[PDB]
Structures are given as C-alpha cells and as structure tokens.
C-alpha cells in the first residue's frame, strides 16, 4: 500500500462555482464559496488556504499560496443529477444516469392517488415543511382522522407522519414500504422514504426516535463494497452509511453536528485501521445552503477550518487526507435546490515534503473512487481516473 489510511471528507454542498452545464439546471451565476466569501467580507479559512484552496480559485479572503501543503484541483460532476445520492455515488466510482427528484410544490397527484389506493388511507399535507411546522398545522387532523401526513424537505425525500397511538408503528412501516416501492419510478424518483412517528397532544407534538428510513442501494457496487470485500476497514462518519445504505461499510459513527463530525474524524485518526475513513459534514447543506443563510454558512465554514490544524498534527506519513464536496448549494441563489457547481479537491499527506502542485481537473467525481481503489489494490471502478501516481 502507498497509504495505510485515507481520510475522505465531504464538505456537503461546498461548491466552488457554476459547472459548464449549469444552464440546464437553472444554475447560471451559482458560486457557493464565492458568494459566502463576499457576504462575510472575506472568509477566514487560513488552514484550507494553506492546503491550497485559493490556488484552486481565489475568492474574497481566500488567496493562493506559493507552497500549498498538498495537491489541489477541482472536480466536475459527470452524472445527470445534482442530488445527495448522485454526488456521493459518483465519488465512490459510479455513473448515475437517473437523477433523484425534489418536490418544492409537493408530490404529483398520480403518486399520492396510488398510495391512497394501496393503503386505504387519506393523505394530507403534501408540501415541503419542517417536522415541527407540519405537526403544528396537521397533527390534530391526523390524530382525529387516521389520515397520513405526507411531506418533503428541500432534498429528495418523502416523509410520512402518523401519531403512534392512532397508527401502530408496524402499520406505519408497512405504509412506508409501499411508498418506497411506488417511488422507484423515474416519474417521481425519491431518494429516501422516512417514517416520522409522533406523540403528544395538540400544541405539544414531538417526533419520536422510532423513525425508520427506506433508502435505495447505490446503482452499482462501489469502491466501498470492494474495500470491505478485501477485508479493509471502511469507517463511515455522519450520513455516509445512510447515503450508501450501508453498502461496503464496516463501522458507522453517528454525528449530531459538524463539530461532532470533526470529533469523530479525530477518533478515527486515533484508531489503528487500514482502509478508508469517510466523513460527511452535513450542516453546510442541511442548515445553511437550503435555508439560503449565507451568514450561518460562513460561520460554519470558519468553525470547520479552525478544527483542521489538529487533523494536520495527527496525520501520519502514510496517511492521505482528501477534502472535497458533492455538489453546490449556493445560499444566495433562487429557490431551495442545490446548484450545479464544480467542487474543490485537496489532497494532502505529511509525506509530501515539497508540498503540492495543481492536478488536472477531475472530469468525474469518480476519480476519488479510482484513486482509493488503486491505493488499496482492489478492483478498479468502471468510471474515474486515479491521481494516485500524481501525488
Ligand atoms: Mn438554480
Ligand atoms: Mn450533499
Ligand atoms: Mn441537500
């Protein structure tokens, strides 16, 4: 092995400017990091700058350095969609023709009609909403009628809420399984169906930890699958295990925040493993990008950057750190959807004594997957070109 451990960090939604095909998606002008930097009157990310973020692209407060710690370039998404699954699945060596859909105006009547026909239940709601908002509005009617509250987020999900005393958990799970079957259809391709049971009285409803998720497996065996099958460790941190529906995962560490994500990364640095530690920092996307909150997004990026020196200190000569993103989600852009953007790529090992250089632009996110596979001597993915030898 060239490297014994690879630490892969997806800064979720942290895009570095509109991709060549951004027009198709209505994403002309999109620039996640750049617009955040302008909002902040300069972003304070000195550690990402030291790695060479500014060498990829100069933005307000983010300048190039003469000697970046590691190698740098950006990646272009090759798959059709810009959704949560597509980006991650491509990173791990796939190509995804069929995008997952989002539903800013709610689900098509055809889909909801079939769900009603199959379940014998009425559906109410059918809108994007937080768990709290939707229960405040509809919790009581749901309790009184035995209907189903169906709602969505800004991502590709169909959520079904029902009071635990009115709809038994096992019946709610059965319904979600029906909904999962109906949404494997490119007319309304849903990434994840989520059971959202709740308890309480009107004006005091709370969602319970009896949530169950119904996700799709990646459309192909991934580099994670190949690592696991070759007896390597694959440690998933945050939503990673969920994103891949556990495929190729040997250990999964739940996280509650970006700072907690960095704590778990540090935990894995302290573990003797051989293979991949794979972190998703999701706050950027979930709390700030979708909510179009550039101030909060900027603060989160500064908080993340300040955690990096400890990571640098713990990396060994045979460790490789890869930092990237999965799509954009520009907090100063119309609507609530992701933006089609290039993503940054930083590749650092303390064994890089002369520092790094610019890499050729990665024509698919799958170049990460290919690099990981080549490093560990496992079957190469169908897509992606390794940059291992460039490091
Ligand atoms: Mn757009
Ligand atoms: Mn994402
Ligand atoms: Mn998202």
CA angle 371, 376, 380 (to 5 degrees): 55
Q: Ligand 1 (ion): which residues have CB within 5 A? A: 26-27
Q: How far is the CA of 354 from the centre of ligand 3 (A)?
A: 37
CA angle 94, 96, 99 (to 5 degrees): 150
Q: Write out the chain in H/E/C secondary structure.
A: CCCCEEEEEEECCCCCCECCCHHHHCCCCCCHHHHHHHHCCCCCCHHHHHHCHHHHCCECCECCCCCCCCEEEEECCCCCCCCHHHHHHHHCCCCCCCCCCCCCCCCCHHHHHHHHHHHCCCEEEEEECCHHHHHHHHHHHHHHHCCEEEEECCCCEEEEEEECCCCCHHHHHHHHHHHHHHCCCCCCCCCEEEEEEEEEECCEEEECCCCEEEECCCCCCCHHHHHHHCCCEEEEECCHHHHCCCCCCCEEECCCCHHHHHHHHHHHHCCCCCEEEEEEECHHHHHHHCCCCHHHHHHHHHHHHHHHHHHHHHCCCCEEEEEECCCECCCCCCCCCCECECEEEEEECCCCCCCCCECCCECCCHHHHHHHHHHHCCCCCCCCCCCHHHC
CATH number for the region 1-97+217-391 comes to 3.40.720.10
Other Cβ atoms less than 10 A from the Cβ of 382: the count is 13
Structure tokens at 284: 């950027």
Q: How far is the CA of 120 from the centre of ligand 3 (A)?
A: 32
Q: Dihedral (C-alpha) 322, 351, 72, 288: value to the nearest 10 degrees? A: 40
Distance CA 276, CA 301 (A): 24
Structure tokens at 368: 């990460």
**Are 233 and 275 within 8 A, CB to CB?**
yes
End-to-end CA distance of the chain: 14
CATH number for the region 98-216 comes to 3.30.70.1250
**Are 240 and 278 within 8 A, CB to CB?**
yes
| Closest ligand relative to 238 C-alpha | 2
**Are 262 and 237 within 8 A, CB to CB?**
no
| Closest ligand relative to 156 C-alpha | 3
Structure tokens at 337: 């959807």
Structure tokens at 374: 């080549």
**Are 332 and 39 within 8 A, CB to CB?**
yes
- Beta strands at 319-324 and 5-11: parallel, antiparallel or unpaired: parallel
- Beta strands at 157-163 and 148-152: parallel, antiparallel or unpaired: antiparallel
327 is in an annotated binding site: yes
Domain-wise residue ranges, the chain: 1-97+217-391, 98-216
**Are 274 and 235 within 8 A, CB to CB?**
no
**Are 10 and 326 within 8 A, CB to CB?**
yes
**Are 346 and 53 within 8 A, CB to CB?**
yes
CA–CA distance from 193 to each of 13, 68, 108, 197, 257 (Å)?
A: 21, 43, 15, 13, 23
Q: Which residue has the tokens 């309304």?
A: 188
């Amino acid at each position: 092995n060239k490297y014994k451990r690879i630490f892969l960090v997806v800064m979720d939604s942290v895009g570095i400017g509109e991709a060549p095909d951004a027009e198709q998606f209505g994403d002309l002008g999109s620039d996640t990091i750049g617009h955040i930097a302008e909002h902040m009157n300069g972003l304070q990310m000195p550690n990402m700058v030291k790695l060479g973020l500014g060498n990829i692209r100069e933005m307000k407060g983010i300048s190039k350095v003469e000697k970046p710690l590691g190698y740098y370039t950006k990646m272009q998404e090759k798959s059709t969609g810009k959704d949560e699954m597509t980006g991650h699945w491509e990173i791990m060596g796939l190509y995804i023709d069929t995008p997952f859909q989002v539903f800013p105006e709610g689900f098509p009547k055809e889909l909801l009609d079939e769900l009603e026909e199959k379940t014998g239940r009425k559906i109410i709601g059918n809108k994007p909403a937080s768990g709290t908002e939707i229960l405040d509005e509809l919790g009581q009617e749901q309790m009184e009628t035995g209907s189903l509250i169906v709602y969505t987020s800004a991502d590709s999900v169909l959520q079904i809420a029902a009071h635990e005393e009115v709809v038994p958990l096992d019946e709610l799970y059965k319904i979600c399984k029906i909904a999962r079957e109906l949404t494997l259809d490119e007319k309304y391709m849903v990434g994840r169906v989520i059971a959202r049971p709740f308890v309480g009285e009107p004006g005091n409803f709370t969602r319970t930890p009896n949530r169950h998720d119904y996700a799709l497996k990646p459309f192909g065996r991934t580099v994670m699958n190949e690592l696991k099958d070759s007896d390597y460790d694959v440690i998933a941190i945050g939503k990673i295990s969920d994103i891949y529906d556990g495929e190729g995962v040997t250990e999964s560490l739940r996280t509650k925040s970006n700072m907690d994500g960095m704590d778990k990364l540090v935990d894995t640095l302290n573990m003797d493993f051989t293979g991949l530690s794979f972190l998703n920092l999701v706050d950027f996307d979930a709390l700030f990008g979708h909510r179009r909150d550039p101030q909060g997004y900027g603060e989160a990026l500064q908080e993340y950057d300040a955690r990096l020196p400890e990571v640098f200190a713990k990396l060994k000569e045979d460790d490789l750190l890869l930092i990237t993103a999965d799509h954009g989600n520009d907090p100063i852009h119309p609507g609530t959807d992701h933006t089609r953007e290039y993503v940054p790529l930083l590749a650092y090992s303390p064994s890089m004594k002369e520092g790094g250089q610019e890499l050729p632009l990665r024509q698919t996110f799958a170049d990460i997957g290919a690099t990981v596979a080549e490093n560990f001597g496992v079957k190469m993915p169908e897509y992606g070109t390794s940059f291992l030898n460039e490091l």
